Each structure stands twice: as structure tokens, then as C-alpha cells.
Amino acid sequence: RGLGTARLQLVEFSAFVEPQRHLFVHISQHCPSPGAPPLESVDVRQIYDKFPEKKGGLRELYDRGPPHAFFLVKFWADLNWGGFYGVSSQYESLEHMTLTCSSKVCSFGKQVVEKVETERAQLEDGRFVYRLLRSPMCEYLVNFLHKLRQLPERYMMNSVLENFTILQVVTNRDTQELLLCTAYVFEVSTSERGAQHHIYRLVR
């Protein structure tokens, strides 16, 4: 499938730096069409420890449901490049909604940043689109990225990134319904191979 539900679909996601653009990670679901197949599944239990077991932790979130709203993205990021560091997200749906978008940056399973944004639906092409464009990337991530690009060896970046995760929770602001919950894990790619990603379903 893709990263989305009947109610809300991710359309594009990127994290980038501008002085053109450099993209650290990118999901295009404009992609688009598959030809096949469905998404592989990963047992959400094997990643409880990469996020806080406190309130709003993975286990708590998944317990309430709905379980089909839960995805894991593995990113191989491109760190070969002080400009403007940005994140851009676009969702779409057929219903009119206001979204609450929470991003939780985690280091060794502890939250070091929570970022909460709100985005109202916008009618376009007979569907509703939710554009969170050019949101300044938090300072901790900028500083982290500047240190990460210093490491002399890709495998050392990977070692450092094995304890770094992001949890993104999109809820219907009005109703409090969870719409999408995405866990992100990270390695690095080469400049030659370019950034890449793999989306899974989280199951239990």
C-alpha cells in the first residue's frame, strides 16, 4: 500500500537544507502507483524501547488504536552537502478536518523535543490538502546534523543513529481521533546511492 489510511494519506515528506535544495530524506507518494505489492509488517513490540514507555508512548498509542493507522519508516539519509533547515509535510483526504501534528524526537528512547503544529484543511482539486511547508527544523536537530556530518565514517554515523528516533502522531484536532502514527529510524546512505526509505506496517 502506501503510508496512509482511508481517512488520511501522506502525500509528500521531506527534510532539507537550503543555502538549490539538499534533501536529507524524502517520501514522495506522488510516487506513485505500485504495480504491487502491499507493505511488509514489523511487530511494533520490537520497537517499544526506541520510544518512551510513558504516556503517549508507542505501546499506549497502539493500545487505543486503530492499529491500521501505524507505520514504521526506515530512512537512509543523505548527509553530504548555515542555510535554512526545513521540514515539509503534505497530507490529503476526502473529509474536511483540522490536524494536530505531533513530532517527538527521541534519544535513547527519551524525548528530547516535542513539536506540535496545527493545519486546517484546504480544498484543492476536489480533495482536501494539508500543507505544513517549510516548518523550521528545531535547533536540536540542526546542531545534531552539523555534528553528524562531521563523523569520518558512515558506519560511525550509523552507530550514532541507532539510538535516534522520531515519532509523528497526526490526530483529528476536533475529535481527538488518531489519524496516522509514524515511527522513524535512521541510517545514512552514500551521496552516490542517494536518500532512500522503506515503509512498513506496524502490527501486533
Cross-strand partners of 12: 28, 90
Q: How far is the CB of 110 from ligand A1H32 (least distance, A)?
A: 16
Q: How far is the CB of 164 from ligand A1H32 (least distance, A)?
A: 6
CB 163 within 8 A of CB 108: yes
Interacting residue with ligand A1H32 among 3, 8, 10, 25 (CB under 6 A): 25
* Alpha-carbon torsion angle 132, 148, 197, 23, nearest 10: 50
Sheet strands side by side (includes 127-136): 22-28, 9-18, 84-93, 127-136, 122-124
Q: Is 137 in the site for ligand A1H32 (CB under 6 A)?
A: yes
Interacting residue with ligand A1H32 among 3, 11, 121, 141 (CB under 6 A): 141
Q: Is 90 in the site for ligand A1H32 (CB under 6 A)?
A: no
**CA distance linking residue 114 with residue 44, whole number of Å:** 21
- Closest CB to ligand A1H32 among 109 and 127? 109
Footprint of ligand A1H32 (CB under 6 A): 15, 24-25, 77, 87, 103, 137, 141, 145, 166, 168, 184, 186
